Amino acid sequence: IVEGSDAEIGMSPWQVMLFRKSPQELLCGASLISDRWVLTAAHCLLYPPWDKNFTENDLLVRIGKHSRTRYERNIEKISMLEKIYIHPRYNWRENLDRDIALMKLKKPVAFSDYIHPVCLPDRETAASLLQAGYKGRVTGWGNLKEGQPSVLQVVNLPIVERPVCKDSTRIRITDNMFCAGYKPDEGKRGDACEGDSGGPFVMKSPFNNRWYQMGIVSWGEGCDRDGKYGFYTHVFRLKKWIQKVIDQFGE
């Protein structure tokens, strides 16, 4: 996260670290949506241009964390993966259209003060909250500049109007994406950066006081550049695929 701040303890209890087994390294962020299902960005698992193609056994998920590098004894839980599901129409060739993937854990993780699932939006929550000007929240352990954080970082960022997102880039933008970030005129700054991807863009519903995951950190061009924006996978738009995977392969 660029221009963010330290997260408070238990502030983002659905935040997951995607962690490579060998060598031991942070791959991406991710999120806990039930006791056995974790959501992330497809490109954290599969990106052929850079020879990225992880299988289940390459990977661990670390849940309940605050510190990036430390083993958080008695606080974090580390889970092995049963199965990975990549959206079948994930577009890694062009624009990361449908940058989404589910990971089923081998065993359920136990909930705690530090480990707790985020809600997935219904149609009405999306309609109501996914509006230009409305702010969501992004968290992760990725780069602080285009070093690395000691602890989980956080930044609140406004959703940007579709024409401004599109006019910011040469990449073709789809209905399965939205962008967020401040304008150069707005003064404030902040963005996701390398390591943050696959993590959640969340919003707190003013109707029922619950946190909903509206987006997945997907891509940008640099980090926190003036006139550029962070692009996020539109979660509600892919929710039918999410429900189909969970219904079918979930117990």
Binding site: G10, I33, Y114, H116, Y134, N156, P158, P206, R210
Partner: peptide, 29 residues
């Protein structure tokens, strides 16, 4: 969704506010 989703044990469940969540509420005009 899961019955208790999005309600944080150390915040919503205890009726504590984190330091910047109000910035989000204030944007929801």
């Amino acid at each position: 969704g899961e019955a208790d989703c999005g309600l944080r044990p150390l915040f919503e469940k205890k009726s504590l506010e984190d330091k910047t969540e109000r910035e989000l509420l204030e944007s929801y005009i």
